Amino acid sequence: TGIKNIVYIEVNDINPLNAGSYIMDDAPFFDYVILFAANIRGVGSDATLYNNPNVQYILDHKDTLIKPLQDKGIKVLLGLLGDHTGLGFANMNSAQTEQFATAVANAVSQYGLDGVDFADAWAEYGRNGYPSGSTGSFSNLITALHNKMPGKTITVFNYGYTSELTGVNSYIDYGIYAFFNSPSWSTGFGMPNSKFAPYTINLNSAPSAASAQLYSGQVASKGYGAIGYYDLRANNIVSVLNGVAKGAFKSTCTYDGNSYPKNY
Amino acid sequence: TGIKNIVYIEVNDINPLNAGSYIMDDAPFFDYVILFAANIRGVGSDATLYNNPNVQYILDHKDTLIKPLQDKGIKVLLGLLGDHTGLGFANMNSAQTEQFATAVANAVSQYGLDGVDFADAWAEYGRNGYPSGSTGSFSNLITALHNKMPGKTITVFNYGYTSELTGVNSYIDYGIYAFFNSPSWSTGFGMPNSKFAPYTINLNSAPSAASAQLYSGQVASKGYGAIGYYDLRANNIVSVLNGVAKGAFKSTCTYDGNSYPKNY
Ligand SMILES: CC(=O)N[C@@H]1[C@@H](O)[C@H](O[C@@H]2O[C@H](CO)[C@@H](O[C@@H]3O[C@H](CO[C@H]4O[C@H](CO[C@H]5O[C@H](CO)[C@@H](O)[C@H](O)[C@@H]5O[C@H]5O[C@H](CO)[C@@H](O)[C@H](O)[C@@H]5O)[C@@H](O)[C@H](O[C@H]5O[C@H](CO)[C@@H](O)[C@H](O)[C@@H]5O[C@H]5O[C@H](CO)[C@@H](O)[C@H](O)[C@@H]5O)[C@@H]4O)[C@@H](O)[C@H](O[C@H]4O[C@H](CO)[C@@H](O)[C@H](O)[C@@H]4O[C@H]4O[C@H](CO)[C@@H](O)[C@H](O)[C@@H]4O[C@H]4O[C@H](CO)[C@@H](O)[C@H](O)[C@@H]4O)[C@@H]3O)[C@H](O)[C@H]2NC(C)=O)[C@@H](CO)O[C@H]1O
Ligand SMILES: CC(=O)N[C@@H]1[C@@H](O)[C@H](O[C@@H]2O[C@H](CO)[C@@H](O[C@@H]3O[C@H](CO[C@H]4O[C@H](CO[C@H]5O[C@H](CO)[C@@H](O)[C@H](O)[C@@H]5O[C@H]5O[C@H](CO)[C@@H](O)[C@H](O)[C@@H]5O)[C@@H](O)[C@H](O[C@H]5O[C@H](CO)[C@@H](O)[C@H](O)[C@@H]5O[C@H]5O[C@H](CO)[C@@H](O)[C@H](O)[C@@H]5O)[C@@H]4O)[C@@H](O)[C@H](O[C@H]4O[C@H](CO)[C@@H](O)[C@H](O)[C@@H]4O[C@H]4O[C@H](CO)[C@@H](O)[C@H](O)[C@@H]4O[C@H]4O[C@H](CO)[C@@H](O)[C@H](O)[C@@H]4O)[C@@H]3O)[C@H](O)[C@H]2NC(C)=O)[C@@H](CO)O[C@H]1O
């Protein structure tokens, strides 16, 4: 397949509809949009899925804040992030793993989402009486979600206990390099180049169009399958994306004019 | 990197040591020798690696039948072939893929081999209740094996479900054109010319030396990186190989006199 553009939107600040305002070759520039993020939270022995008031609002208003992206062909994923309780993706027991995977699959079904993204950061492993080290639950969680959501996408931000995931990487559609604005010509957890983004642009502290065209052209020539983006804002950042369009796609990217505020 | 000579030996018939008897520029003429072939066999739900008595004899006698080739700098790969059970590289489920990848990696480690060659032929897909069509496992099998045996070689004979392998071709060192004694100036699964043999000689039903020199010169001048060979026997076939040496390498090939019988 062609190179996919995968964007994480910090929905505490930014209306995710802005991802749809960018066009390349009569199609959306962005292929995947990650609502960053819902949280795993340990609560006693339970492994819970927690949506903060901004995420919950977007899910509660899926017809107006998610579906128009999906109407254009964009796949919308629920981002998943640690949240300082001491329990994260990599230190659950068998019951907690099954419980968390059930919650996530039910949320993806209930809100008509296209899958999920895993970002193993900020769990603060070991706090509040949970194990301080890995139990092996991270691979089992991927496996459980693959069995529960056939046909849906799983992406992994390459940070935290991801080195453990090599054995289940056939269940993972894309991996994403964790540092911004400079490429690293490798992949994590054994992913082939065609399933990895070795270059990830911070669109808030944005690099120049010249740098984006330089590196995006190298993404294509070296045969990688994706480019990552983090923290798209509500300003028109097409200068940078047009650099990527010229570099990786031999094309151009334009703005449709729609700037969507976060009135919630 | 110069042109590599890659030879498949039908070890049901031929002692593989014969590949070491040919010399070009004070080095082995052949760079890779494939022991053709171990098999994938479905047994119930298991995906198994089966070595027939000739293959198993060679592996059990690695010090006398494999190591002398490796001492000369020749790389020796285990050939992998379907075997009429209905299960093959391209129709496994995830557990079978992991299971077969593990069995192959372990044999490569146990017998001190330099890697493997995949020939997706003779599986008879769909026999014995196995899936009749592709599951997508061929690409995952290459990924799983690359991750399990780092620093080893993977070659792919361009026959069977190989059109699926474009996404993992960075894990494949060489692809081999599947038909004999006439070049086809293209490659499979997105491979660059430098990683492909577009010309494969049958050394049993051998072409003329003049033919071999004509076509091998075109291999070099068109920028390809390998030439393939099938069914080297125990007779002195240097006349053909010297034709290739004159064509592709602007040199000569000689025989060292050693004819090794299959007394096993
Ligand atoms: C160090 C380093 O660098 N590191 C790195 C990393 O970082 C990375 O990662 C990646 O990347 C990215 C970027 O970087 C990231 O992101 C980021 O993050 C961060 C962090 O976060 C986290 O944490 C936090 C905190 O927490 C704490 O606190 C809180 C409050 O208080 C609480 O609550 C909690 O719980 C905690 O606490 C606890 O703990 C502690 C400690 O232990 C203790 O002490 C206590 O006591 C307790 O216990 C948090 O908050 C978060 O979370 C949140 O969010 C999320 C999303 O993100 C979600 O999911 C969740 O849910 C949450 O949300 C919710 O909540 C909140 C709170 O409450 C609210 O607000 C909301 O609304 C909701 O409701 C986490 O966990 C951070 O910080 C950041 O942020 C930033 O950015 C953003 C975007 O843009 C924004 O929005 C914000 O605001 C901020 O801003 C800032 O910065 C920026 C940038 O530049 C700018 O623009 C602005 O302007 C600002 O600035 C300012 O400030 C700064 C500082 O602050 C300075 O510098 C400047 O100058 C100025 O001043 C971000 O977000 C991420 O994560 C990642 N990514 C992915 C995964 O994809 C890595 C990799 O790359 O690497 C490393 O190296
Ligand atoms: C058609 C066409 O053409 N096609 C093509 C193809 O072929 C190709 O491919 C490629 O190339 C090459 C060449 O061609 C190849 O190779 C070949 O192959 C073939 C086949 O094989 C396969 O199959 C077989 C059969 O099977 C069956 O049977 C058996 C017995 O009985 C059984 O066991 C089985 O199972 C099966 O059965 C089953 O199934 C069936 C069907 O379905 C049914 O019916 C039944 O009932 C059952 O169920 C087989 O056998 C094989 O296998 C084997 O081998 C392998 C190696 O190769 C291994 O791996 C395995 O393991 C095995 O071995 C084992 O076993 C056996 C048996 O038992 C024994 O014996 C041994 O020892 C061990 O143990 C497969 O699978 C074949 O046939 C061929 O062969 C031939 O050659 C060789 C070499 O040189 C030799 O050695 C032999 O012997 C033969 O010989 C012959 O021929 C030749 C020439 O070649 C000559 O020289 C001689 O002399 C002879 O002749 C004779 O005969 C003929 C006929 O045969 C006639 O013609 C004449 O005249 C005379 O008489 C070969 O091998 C390959 O494969 C590939 N390559 C690669 C690299 O891959 C493609 C491509 O090119 O194309 C297409 O087109």
DSSP letter assigned to residue A158: S
User: Could you tell me if A93 and A137 are in contact, meaning their C-beta atoms sit under 8 angstroms apart?
Assistant: yes
Q: Is the peptide bond before A37 cis (omega within 30 degrees of 0)?
A: yes
SS (H, E, C) chain B: CCCEEEEEEECCCCCHHHHHHEEECCEECCCEEEEEEEEEEEECCEEEEECCHHHHHHHHCHHHHCHHHHHCCCEEEEEEEECCCCCCCCCCCHHHHHHHHHHHHHHHHHCCCCEEEEECCCCCCCHHHCCCCCCCHHHHHHHHHHHHCCCCEEEEECCCHHHHHHHHHHHCCEEECCCECCCCCCCCCCCCHHHEECCEEECCCCCCHHHHHHHHHHHHHCCCCEEEEECCCCCCCHHHHHHHHHHHCCCCCEECCCCCCCCC
Token digits of residue B3? 């042109």
User: Could you tell me if A234 and A18 are in contact, meaning their C-beta atoms sit under 8 angstroms apart?
Assistant: yes
Token digits of residue A137? 């639950």
| Residue A109 domain flag | yes
The closest alpha carbon to A189, from A120, A248, A102, A103, belongs to: A120
User: CA nearest A2 in B: which residue?
Assistant: B167
Instruction: Take atom 67 of ligand 1 and give the residue whose Cα is closest.
Output: A52
Q: How was this structure determined?
A: X-ray
Largest CA distance in chain A: 53
DSSP letter assigned to residue A223: T
H or E stretch including A67?
helix A67-71
At residue A177, φ and ψ (nearest 5 deg) are -65, 140
User: CA nearest A171 in B: which residue?
Assistant: B94
Check pocket membership of A181 for ligand 1, CB cut-off 6 A: no
| Residue B85 domain flag | yes
Measure the CA–CA gap between B261 and B8, rounded to whole angstroms: 17
| Residue A91 domain flag | yes
Q: Is the peptide bond before B37 cis (omega within 30 degrees of 0)?
A: yes
Q: In chain B, which residues touch A (CB < 8 A)?
A: 94, 97-98, 139-140, 143-144, 146-147, 166-168, 170-171
Check pocket membership of A229 for ligand 1, CB cut-off 6 A: no
Question: Going by C-beta distance under 8 Å and a sequence separation of 6 or more, which residues neighbour residue A107?
Answer: A38, A49, A51, A59, A78, A113
* Centre of ligand 2 from the C-alpha of residue A62, in Å: 60
The closest alpha carbon to A8, from B85, A18, B71, belongs to: A18
Q: How many residues does chain A have?
A: 264
Helices B137-148 & B94-110 angle (0-180, nearest 10): 40
Judged on CB neighbours under 10 Å (0-12, 13-18, 19+), B15 is middle
Identify all chain A residues contacting B97, using CB atoms and an 8 Å cutoff: 170
Residue B140 has its nearest CB partner, among A170, A193, A194, at A170
H or E stretch including A23?
strand A22-23
In chain B the first and final C-alpha atoms are separated, in Å, by: 37
* Centre of ligand 2 from the C-alpha of residue B88, in Å: 17
Helices A209-221 & A238-249 angle (0-180, nearest 10): 30
* Centre of ligand 2 from the C-alpha of residue B202, in Å: 15
Helices A94-110 & A137-148 angle (0-180, nearest 10): 40
Alpha helices (H) along A81-167: 94-110, 137-148
Identify all chain A residues contacting B146, using CB atoms and an 8 Å cutoff: 190
Check pocket membership of A128 for ligand 1, CB cut-off 6 A: no
The closest alpha carbon to B174, from B220, B217, B104, B115, belongs to: B115
Question: Going by C-beta distance under 8 Å and a sequence separation of 6 or more, which residues neighbour residue A75?
Answer: A31, A32, A33, A114, A115, A153
Q: Do A192 and B94 touch (CB under 8 A)?
A: no
Chain A / chain B CB contacts < 8 angstroms? 27
Token digits of residue A39? 């949280």
Q: Do B94 and A171 touch (CB under 8 A)?
A: yes
| Sheet architecture: strand order including B27-28 | B27-28, B22-24, B254-255
The closest alpha carbon to A185, from A230, A221, A157, belongs to: A221
User: CA nearest B138 in A: which residue?
Assistant: A170
Measure the CA–CA gap between B37 and B122, rounded to whole angstroms: 12
Measure the CA–CA gap between A37 and A120, rounded to whole angstroms: 11
Judged on CB neighbours under 10 Å (0-12, 13-18, 19+), B64 is exposed
At residue B13, φ and ψ (nearest 5 deg) are -115, -40
Identify all chain A residues contacting B135, using CB atoms and an 8 Å cutoff: none
| Residue B80 domain flag | yes
Atom of ligand 1 nearest to the CA of A79: 59
Check pocket membership of A84 for ligand 1, CB cut-off 6 A: yes
Q: How many residues does chain B have?
A: 264
Q: What angle do CA B58, B59, B63 make, to 5 degrees?
A: 80
Resolution of the coordinates, Å: 1.9
Measure the CA–CA gap between B137 and B123, rounded to whole angstroms: 14
Q: In chain A, which residues touch B (CB < 8 A)?
A: 166-167, 169-171, 190-195, 223, 225
Question: Parallel, antiparallel, or unpaired: how do β-strands A254-255 and A226-230 relate?
Answer: unpaired
| Residue B261 domain flag | no
| Residue B262 domain flag | no
Instruction: Take atom 39 of ligand 2 and give the residue whose Cα is closest.
Output: B84
Write out the residue range of the structural domain in which residue B86 sits. 4-255
Q: Do B166 and A193 touch (CB under 8 A)?
A: no
Q: Do B143 and A167 touch (CB under 8 A)?
A: no
* Residue for token pair 């990487």: A169
User: CA nearest B136 in A: which residue?
Assistant: A170
User: Could you tell me if B175 and B196 are in contact, meaning their C-beta atoms sit under 8 angstroms apart?
Assistant: yes
Measure the CA–CA gap between A175 and A159, rounded to whole angstroms: 10
| Residue B64 domain flag | yes
Identify all chain A residues contacting B144, using CB atoms and an 8 Å cutoff: 170
Q: Do A190 and B143 touch (CB under 8 A)?
A: yes
| Residue A226 domain flag | yes
Measure the CA–CA gap between B230 and B66, rounded to whole angstroms: 18
Q: Do A190 and B147 touch (CB under 8 A)?
A: yes
Q: Residue B228 — left, alpha, or beta (φ > 0 → left; ψ -120 to 50 → alpha)?
A: beta
Measure the CA–CA gap between B252 and B255, rounded to whole angstroms: 10
* Domain count of the fold of chain B: 1
Instruction: Take atom 98 of ligand 2 and give the residue whose Cα is closest.
Output: B204
CATH number, residue A108: 3.20.20.80
* Centre of ligand 1 from the C-alpha of residue A140, in Å: 28
Neighbours of A83 (CB within 10 A): 21
